[PDB]
Design a protein around this nucleic acid. Sequence first.
DNA 1: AAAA
Length: 358
Amino acid sequence: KISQYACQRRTTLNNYNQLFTDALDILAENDELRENEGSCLAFMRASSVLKSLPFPITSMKDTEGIPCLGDKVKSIIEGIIEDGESSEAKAVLNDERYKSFKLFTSVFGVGLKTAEKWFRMGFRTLSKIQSDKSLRFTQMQKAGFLYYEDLVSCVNRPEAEAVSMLVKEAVVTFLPDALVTMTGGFRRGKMTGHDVDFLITSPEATEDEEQQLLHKVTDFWKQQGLLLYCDILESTFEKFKQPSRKVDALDHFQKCFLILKLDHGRVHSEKEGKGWKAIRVDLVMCPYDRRAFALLGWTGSRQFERDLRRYATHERKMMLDNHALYDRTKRVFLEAESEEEIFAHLGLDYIEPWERNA
DNA sequence: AAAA
Ligand SMILES: [Mg+2]
Ligand code: NA
Ligand SMILES: [Zn+2]
């Protein structure tokens, strides 16, 4: 019996149901754009459970015993079995609002509100937006347009590794005992990503040293001429606050959203223009004692994290977020030195990072 | 808006 929770499923990158899940992901994305949160969640849970299957669906009978497959979802699956296409997902792909929202939000610094504003102004192409003489752009959007082609091309593993080397070299210069871990999609085994994420932590750094590291590292890159964009969010972390109750938990750790200049000579790949590539990089600094909670939250996937927190609350009366694990019955915070200890506290079989592609 |  396949669990309704992604945290009780093993979801690897050999997806045998991409025909179904690509269509369900499009429908979920459209529901997000149309502000239909409920329908979005239902399509995400259905897509997630099919991604966990070790075999492709080839008949409606193959869907028996699978949870999170409501009547609307089963009609979509039936239609794809019929002629290899989803008429519902095809209509979303041809919808003018959907096309414009995908295109506009593909720019770094453009979210749902700005994409909606530009659509209602009559804009449909990035060329018309960039060349407009009346529009005013945020600093984030200016960087998004300046480095657009590099940011929309996928970051691959040789590029992610080259960025890891840069991050580690900069960090150990100021904190030699620091631990730097690549998180997100690449930690889950993905071949590509839209960015490269890292978790930094130091066992001996002070509260002030911990606060200053991201400022020191980004000033070092700024001096080197490698910092193309930088936004540092100061920590709002509270050592003794209960973890978040929210469906989508916020991360309160100090972090930075960057664009780095990655010189082609630093990339050891099988394969050239300007000789460098703009790469989105996120750095997160956390206190040493919370490193396993942060690693778990930043490794993802988003669906795996949502179900982990939902399982903790509904099944174990525990409160989990990126900073801590609190037991409401025992009235104690639970400590962990690894992700394995967090899973053990939750009464879950350990799911490897490459098995969290829910 | 940036974020798994
Ligand atoms: Mg990522
Ligand atoms: Na965007
Ligand atoms: Zn990121």
